Amino acid sequence: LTKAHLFHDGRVQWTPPAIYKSSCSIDVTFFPFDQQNCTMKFGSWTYDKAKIDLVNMHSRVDQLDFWESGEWVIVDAVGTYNTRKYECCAEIYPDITYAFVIRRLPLFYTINLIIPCLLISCLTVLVFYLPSECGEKITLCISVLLSLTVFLLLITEIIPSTSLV
Amino acid sequence: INLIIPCLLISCLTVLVFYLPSECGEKITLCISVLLSLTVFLLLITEIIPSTSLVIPLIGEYLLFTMIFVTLSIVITVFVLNVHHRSPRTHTMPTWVRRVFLDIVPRLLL
Amino acid sequence: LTKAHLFHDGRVQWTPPAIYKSSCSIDVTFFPFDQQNCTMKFGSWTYDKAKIDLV
Amino acid sequence: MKRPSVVDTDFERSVKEDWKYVAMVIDRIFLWMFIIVCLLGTVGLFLPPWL
Ligand SMILES: *[C@@H]1O[C@H](CO)[C@@H](O)[C@H](O)[C@H]1NC(C)=O
Ligand SMILES: *[C@@H]1O[C@H](CO)[C@@H](O)[C@H](O)[C@H]1NC(C)=O
Ligand SMILES: CC(=O)OCC[N+](C)(C)C
Ligand SMILES: CC(=O)OCC[N+](C)(C)C
Ligand SMILES: [Ca+2]
C-alpha cells in the first residue's frame, strides 16, 4: 500500500511493489537444459466484467530494471487477456495471465553433476578388461554401483517428485 | 582449513597409483578412493557456492581437472594390471613391444 | 517506526532500525579468497526528483 | 584371439590354465556387448532429443 499518484482529471496511478509466490508446474525432462514456463494469473476477485474490466497496459512484461540472476534468463514474458465464467457466479470475470518462459543456464549443473556422472560411468566397462588374478574386480564394479546410487539420490533432491515425466 | 587443506592432501595422492607395485593388488583401491574423495569434495563445495553459470570457482575447476586426470589414471592402471598378468600361455609378446619397452624406453627413463 | 526527534526550527530527525535482505550478485571466482560487492539501492518510491531530493 | 599354441605336460596345471582362459574369453564377450550397448544405448537415448 504505497501512495498513489493522483492527477487533476481523476486518473490514478498506483505501482506498489510485491513479492509473489505463485505455483507453476515444472517439467525436468531435459534438465539441466530445461525451459520452464511458469505463469501468474491476475484478475479482479469480486467485480465481474460488467463492473471492472482489465486492459493490457503493454503486452510485454517490463524488464528494463530486471536484476540479472545469473541462473535463469527470461526468453519471453507476455500477458494474455482472458475471460471465463465460473460456477460460483453468473457473470463473466476477466483476468490477465502472464507466462514467464525462463531458460536455465546449464553450465553450473553440467560441471557439478553431468561431468562427474560421466566420469564414473566411463568405468562401467573397465572391469571386464581387468585380469581376474588382480583380486580387485569386485572393488571396481561395487564402487561404481555405489557411486551412481549416490548420484541418483542427489538428483532426487533437486527435481520435483512428479510422475508425469 | 576445512576445504583447501583436505583437497591438497587428497591431490597429493593423485599420482601415487603409478608408483604402487602391481603385486600389492591395491592400486584400484587407492585410485578409486582418490576419485571418490575428490567427487565428494566437489559436491560439498557445490552446496556453498551459488548456482550461477557466469563464473566458475577456481577451486571447482581444479577439482574437476584433477578428477579427469584421476579417471585417466584409473583407466591406465586397469590397462597396466591387465598387462602385468600376462604369460606365454595366454598372450604372445610381439617383437616390437619387446624391443621398445626393454631396450629404448627403459634406457631413456634411467 | 520509532519516535522522531523534532526541533524548534522545524528540523526532523528519524533514526529507525531496519533488517534488510538485499539481493547481491556473488562472484566466487576466488573463493574462499573472494571479495564481494553487495549493494543496497535506496530511494523514494513515489516522490520524484521535483518533490523529494535526497542528499 | 589366438591362444598361444604352447604345450603342457602336467594335467592339473594344464586344466587350471584352460579354465583361466575360459574366464578370459567370457570377459571379452561382455566387454564387447557392454561397449556396444553403452555406445548404442547412449546414442539412442540422447541423440533424438538433440534433433
Ligand atoms: C507457456 O504456457 C502458456 C500457458 O500455459 C501457453 O499459452 C504458452 O504457449 C506456453 N509457451 C511455451 C513456450 O511453452
Ligand atoms: C562495486 O560495484 C559498484 C556498482 O556495482 C561499482 O561502481 C564499484 O566500482 C564496485 N567496487 C569495486 C571495488 O570495484
Ligand atoms: C463473487 C466472488 O467473490 O467471486 C470470487 C471468485 N471468482 C474470482 C472466481 C469470481
Ligand atoms: C509512481 C510510482 O509509484 O512509482 C514506483 C516505481 N518506481 C520506484 C520505479 C518509481
Ligand atoms: Ca586383495
From Swiss-Prot, chain A:
Changing residue 68 to A: Loss of CHRNA4:CHRNB2 channel opening potentiation by divalent cations. It is found in: Synaptic cell membrane; Cell membrane. The chain crosses the membrane at residues 113-132, 138-154. Changing residue 157 to K: Loss of CA(2+) permeability. Glycans are attached at residue 37. Disulfide bonds join 24-38, 88-89. A lipid is attached at residue 134 (S-palmitoyl cysteine). Component of neuronal acetylcholine receptors (nAChRs) that function as pentameric, ligand-gated cation channels with high calcium permeability among other activities. nAChRs are excitatory neurotrasnmitter receptors formed by a collection of nAChR subunits known to mediate synaptic transmission in the nervous system and the neuromuscular junction. Each nAchR subunit confers differential attributes to channel properties, including activation, deactivation and desensitization kinetics, pH sensitivity, cation permeability, and binding to allosteric modulators. Neuronal AChR is composed of two different types of subunits: alpha and beta. CHRNA4 forms heteropentameric neuronal acetylcholine receptors with CHRNB2 and CHRNB4, as well as CHRNA5 and CHRNB3 as accesory subunits. Found in two major stoichiometric forms, LS (low agonist sensitivity): (CHRNA4)3:(CHRNB2)2 and HS (high agonist sensitivity): (CHRNA4)2:(CHRNB2)3, the two stoichiometric forms differ in their unitary conductance, calcium permeability, ACh sensitivity and potentiation by divalent cation. Cells produce predominantly an (CHRNA4)3:(CHRNB2)2 nAChR. It is linked to Epilepsy, nocturnal frontal lobe, 1: An autosomal dominant focal epilepsy characterized by nocturnal seizures with hyperkinetic automatisms and poorly organized stereotyped movements. Belongs to the ligand-gated ion channel (TC 1.A.9) family. Acetylcholine receptor (TC 1.A.9.1) subfamily. Alpha-4/CHRNA4 sub-subfamily. This is Neuronal acetylcholine receptor subunit alpha-4.
